A paper describes a structure:
Here, we describe the isolation of a potent bnAb, pT1679, from a COVID-19 convalescent patient. pT1679 is a YYDxxG antibody capable of neutralizing a broad range of human, bat, and pangolin sarbecoviruses in a pseudotype neutralization assay, and it protects Syrian hamsters against challenge with SARS-CoV-2 Wuhan and Omicron strains. In summary, we identified a YYDRxxG antibody (pT1679) capable of binding to a very broad range of Sarbecovirus S proteins.
The recognized epitope is located on the inner face of the RBD that is buried in the RBD “down” conformation and identifies pT1679 as a Barnes class 4/Cao class F2 antibody. (A) pT1679 is a class 4 antibody that binds to the S protein in the RBD in “up” conformation. The contact interface is dominated by a long CDRH3 prominently contacting RBD residue P384 with its tip. Additional interactions with CDRL2 extend the epitope towards the ACE2 binding site (RBD residues between 403–427 and 505; detailed interface characteristics are summarized in Table S3). The interaction with CDRH3 features a salt bridge between DH134 and R408, an RBD residue that is mutated to serine in Omicron BA.2, BA.4/5, and other Omicron variants, thus explaining the failure of pT1679 to neutralize these VOCs. Although the pT1679 epitope and ACE2 binding site do not overlap extensively, pT1679 is expected to compete with ACE2 binding due to steric hindrance from the positioning of the light chain. In general, the epitope targeted by pT1679 is highly conserved or conservatively substituted between SARS-CoV-2 and other sarbecoviruses. Surface plasmon resonance (SPR) analysis with either trimeric SARS-CoV-2 S ectodomain or recombinant RBD revealed dissociation constants KD in the picomolar range for the interaction with pT1679 Fab.
Numbering used by the authors:
A (entry chain A): 334 to 528
B (entry chain L): 4 to 114
C (entry chain H): 20 to 147
């Protein structure tokens, strides 16, 4: 049985980046040659491992993470980087062994008048740990007194929408992103490349 | 040859000031990104923007930037006397096989 | 991550100069180190780049042949030599470094990013 990469890369819809999705890949054969030969991708980069070697390697687990961001923000998805996405929405560990893959989704994820369903987290009282996630929409407070859940100056709602219109410049157009992470322990391999 | 950039710019306190940087068919015209640095006297350069518009953590929120056509731009906003420095742009050039830098821009406050 | 750099130089024309840099507070081996120069009152210039695990540098065409770059795994240190010096070689030289490790593209070639996130204190070299 081949691994279910069609449920990852060919789904209809993707998560908002503050509430990013993860999927586990196990007990299957991973034909990675399908991915790195594809013309579908506007960016494809691997860390710790070369793409051609993924056909030979074996892993205890594999994980696939999925979300939508702006075309300019993709550069914040790398080990050691900092910014609104890297600090408060999605954090990679310094040991990251895996690949980052992205493609333009303007015809899917934009709409006339702007698609406001996609959100990111603009505020948080402290930075994320690697692979941390959150949901709670509590008011960010930084004023002289507590905000008590009421909006105002230094009493801010923590999330902001992207608002993708169909005709904006390529750095403001929506991009779909997949991050693949490879895991190996003393516990036996459950994913391998084909032979 | 290298990225073309104006020698100096100026504005009043609390205003916006815009610095421009422009490439060729190589570099910015080939679709490569542009990055921006600041230098104070007697001191090594400091990064302000990467990836056309990404701003590091710990750079203040007045600095914004973009890329369009064969050009990129830096905007300084809510201007203060602390913002007097020399500003450089950078991009990759596939016809040099390495980095290229602009000629620099000394900002000045009008007082 | 903090870079630390060699002290200043004074030399006659036709002599040669050694410049050096050290990393601290993190991994040395997987990160690109780049050498930059700045003449007095003038814009920045890129000379060349090394990744220690591959050892062979990239060089800018103006500096290739007069300049050579090298690094040590055991001491977390990078070095440069400039040869057959002339008066216009009077400048400040900086080491600088990427914020991310090198990466493999779709064809398995190692690559590095042109952003200089971290900078050394700079070495003033002077030629009589
Ligand atoms: C996604 O769908 C296209 C069109 O059917 C196919 O060519 C491609 O291989 C698929 N990719 C994955 C990883 O499922």
């Amino acid at each position: 049985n081949l691994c279910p990469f069609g449920e990852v890369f060919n789904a209809t819809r993707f998560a908002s980046v503050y509430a990013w999705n993860r999927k586990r890949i196990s007990n299957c054969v991973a034909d990675y040659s399908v991915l790195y030969n594809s013309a579908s991708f506007s960016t494809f980069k691997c860390y710790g491992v070369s793409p051609t070697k993924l056909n030979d390697l074996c892993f205890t687990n594999v994980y696939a993470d999925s979300f939508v961001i702006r075309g300019d923000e993709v550069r914040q998805i790398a080990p050691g980087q900092t910014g609104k996405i890297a600090d408060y929405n999605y954090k990679l560990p310094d040991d990251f062994t895996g690949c980052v893959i992205a493609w333009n989704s303007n015809n899917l994820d934009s709409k006339v008048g702007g698609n406001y369903n996609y959100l990111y987290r603009l505020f948080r009282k402290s930075n994320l740990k690697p692979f941390e996630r959150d949901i709670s929409t509590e008011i960010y407070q930084a004023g002289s007194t507590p905000c008590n859940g009421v909006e105002g100056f230094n009493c801010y709602f923590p999330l902001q929408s992207y608002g993708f219109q169909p005709t904006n410049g390529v750095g403001y157009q929506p991009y779909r992103v997949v991050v693949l992470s490879f895991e190996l322990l003393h516990a036996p391999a459950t994913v391998c490349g084909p032979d | 040859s290298v990225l073309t950039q104006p020698p100096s710019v100026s504005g009043a306190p609390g205003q916006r000031v815009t610095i421009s940087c422009t490439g060729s068919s190589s570099n910015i015209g080939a679709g490569y990104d542009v990055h921006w640095y600041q230098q104070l006297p007697g001191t090594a350069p400091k990064l302000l923007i990467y990836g056309n518009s990404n701003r590091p953590s710990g750079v203040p929120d007045r600095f914004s930037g973009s890329k369009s056509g064969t050009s990129g731009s830096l905007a300084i906003s809510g201007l203060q006397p602390e913002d007097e420095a020399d500003y450089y742009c950078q991009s990759y050039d596939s016809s040099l096989s390495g980095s290229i830098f602009g000629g620099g821009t000394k900002l000045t406050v009008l007082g | 991550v903090q870079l630390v750099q060699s002290g200043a130089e004074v030399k006659k024309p036709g002599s040669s100069v050694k410049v050096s840099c050290r990393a601290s507070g993190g991994t040395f081996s997987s990160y690109a180190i780049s050498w930059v120069r700045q003449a007095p009152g003038q814009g920045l210039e890129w000379m060349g780049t090394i990744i220690p695990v591959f050892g062979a540098p990239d060089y800018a065409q103006k500096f290739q042949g007069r300049v050579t770059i090298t690094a040590d795994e055991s001491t977390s240190t990078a070095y440069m030599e400039v040869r057959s010096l002339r008066s216009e070689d009077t400048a400040v030289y900086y080491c600088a470094r990427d914020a991310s490790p090198y990466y493999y593209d779709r064809s398995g070639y190692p690559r590095w990013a042109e952003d200089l996130h971290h900078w050394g204190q700079g070495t003033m070299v002077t030629v009589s």
